[PDB]
UniProtKB/TrEMBL annotation, chains A, B, C, D:
The keyword Metal-binding applies. This is Permease. Mg(2+) 1 binds at P126, D128, D148, L182. Transmembrane segments: none annotated. It comes from the Bacteria. The keyword Metal-binding applies. Mg(2+) 2 binds at D148, A181, G183, N185, D187. Keywords: Metal-binding. One of its GO terms (molecular function) is metal ion binding. InterPro entries: DUF3238.
């Protein structure tokens, strides 16, 4: 009846630039580039997110396909001498996976997990989410998510090439949270049936 | 002839506190306790070192013994309101080792490797040194070493309970190295004969 | 017959920037620009000193000449949001003087006095020195000085366009000293014949 | 009709301690004692003001009397190692005065000026106020005032031992000023008839 059902996850920083840090050792002032954008599902391959993942369940084919990416990190360093210098790196995508795919008569389930650190500052703990998602042949979905409290998170489902539907969003700046929340374990969780 | 020769290794931050890192938006300021001392052989069991290691070759017993230890890590956080909060942790010694001991006619060979990470940040990079030493029955040594460019490293020999003798010292505030030098590979090497 | 003889005084900050001061009221970090150099006699008119003075006694003309100058003060302010601002000002030279010139049979005496404020930091007490110098007709000098403990002080002589010769240097990081030494009385003193 | 008319002025810091400043050269966090009070005309002799002044015009003897005082300054310095150390001094009252008394049948005018340094810091900017007050025989007054934008300022009038009345107040924290407003010129001014 319904053929293709896609789940999209995005992790992004809304600001142009992260919170400024100063190292008295070097005299520098450093910040990393953001994604300069609000919430939206239309940001694929746009490089306006730190982590991006899409799983596509294909019932016609009896297949799960996954797509995983990380944005580019740019650090802006202002030297004592005043000069500014940018450096570029890209997080690994080794730990953005789609795992534990299990089939039954009327659907499939799997877990999506993402862990990506900042390639240019190693002292930083990685962002993490994991969702346990169950999809039925009818089209409706059933998700159990956890994620670090920072930065912003957005999840959408899109079925048979139609319009996108909001699964769940987390807005750190509405929530009181900060980059501290990236350490520890995954502070938040949610349940959602669409 | 000569019976006991000891090799001492010591890594230390000569300041009372590491140079401050500050988070501009919050005003928060972060520092790590140092060892507040200069170069000195007599620092054993004093907890004035990040890493501390002694290898004792005993020609009279045909034996090699070793001691290894880490200092305590203290994170001091100053809040915008001048409130101060401390945290304590102790790096594991699991990777301060004396390995590849080879006994032959002329004396003995072995390699001392130290690698200690920050018990308060799992993600920080570790300090590293490796020493390849060769000790002769007459009390000559031959040393080939590598180490990170930060913080301070000092190495000493002492024979038959005699005075200490400097093998090698490295002082990051002379070579202009930084806390960054704790990552990557070991960036200095040396060779010394006593 | 020795013709002309020179005394050069230089007060400079060896670092590129003085050490940060932070205000939890405004959230800001402030530093002033240093002179980014080591001790050297060849620094005239390079603007690489906070205060600089040359007294020249001419035995051919029987005259004393003096040059005096201050470098430029540059204040750098980092803001909570990582913006940086510079301001700029130049200390008055009115209080860098050469004084009480007395001539006798065998040479000349005089007094070099320096006092300079920070034009951007009124909170700054002046840097201060005074040299009492006695120059014999044959190119010998007898100097007696006082100075504040911070920053660095260098004094040289130069006879008849010859090489420069060190009279006295003060290095504040060697003698464990602080910008506090700027206030109060002149902390240090010396006498030298050369 | 009216015999005694008192004008009272108080300069105070509402909070227990001024906002901390940190110095990276020494690691010290340093804040000064405030007056830990809100606005109140009843604070004479209470040592809960930096500056206090009362002028009393006495229409019965035809005399103007004046009383001037500064508070105790106390700096708390927290050392990098935890230990705290207090110094105390007391600002001079040499520049809190009442001058330019001119009498006529109608009443009297005079000027009240206050300037007071921080007595541990010679070169710190004084707090300043200057009031031009006209006192009429019927008891009414007319005041043109100027003051620095920090810290807090309260002025009151009292006739024939009656209750106090507010002339004017300045709360630097409603108006978003800072300790910088201490410097340069008196940023605020006001005019009052009551
Ligand atoms: Mg995490
Ligand atoms: Mg967490
Ligand atoms: Mg290295
Ligand atoms: Mg390393
Ligand atoms: Mg001085
Ligand atoms: Mg002094
Ligand atoms: Mg003022
Ligand atoms: Mg002002």
């Amino acid at each position: 009846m319904t053929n293709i059902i896609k789940i999209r996850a995005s992790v992004f920083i809304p600001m142009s630039w992260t919170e400024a840090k100063m190292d008295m050792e070097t005299g520098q002032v450093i910040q990393f580039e953001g994604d300069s954008r609000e919430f939206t599902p239309h940001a694929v391959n746009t490089m306006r997110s730190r982590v991006e993942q899409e799983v596509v369940v294909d019932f016609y084919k009896q297949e799960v396909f996954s797509y995983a990416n990380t944005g580019i990190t740019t650090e802006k360093v202002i030297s004592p001498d005043g000069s500014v210098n940018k450096r570029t790196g890209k997080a690994s995508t080794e730990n953005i996976v789609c795992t534990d795919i299990v089939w039954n008569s009327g659907g499939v389930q799997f877990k999506m997990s993402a862990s990506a650190s900042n390639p240019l500052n190693v002292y930083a703990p990685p962002v993490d989410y994991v969702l346990n998602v169950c999809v039925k042949k009818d089209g409706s979905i059933d998700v159990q998510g956890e994620h670090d409290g920072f930065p912003c998170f957005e999840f959408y489902k899109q079925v048979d090439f139609g319009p996108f539907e909001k699964i769940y969003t987390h807005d750190f700046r509405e929530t009181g949270d900060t980059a501290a929340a990236l350490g520890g374990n995954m502070d938040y969780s949610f349940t959602k049936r669409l």
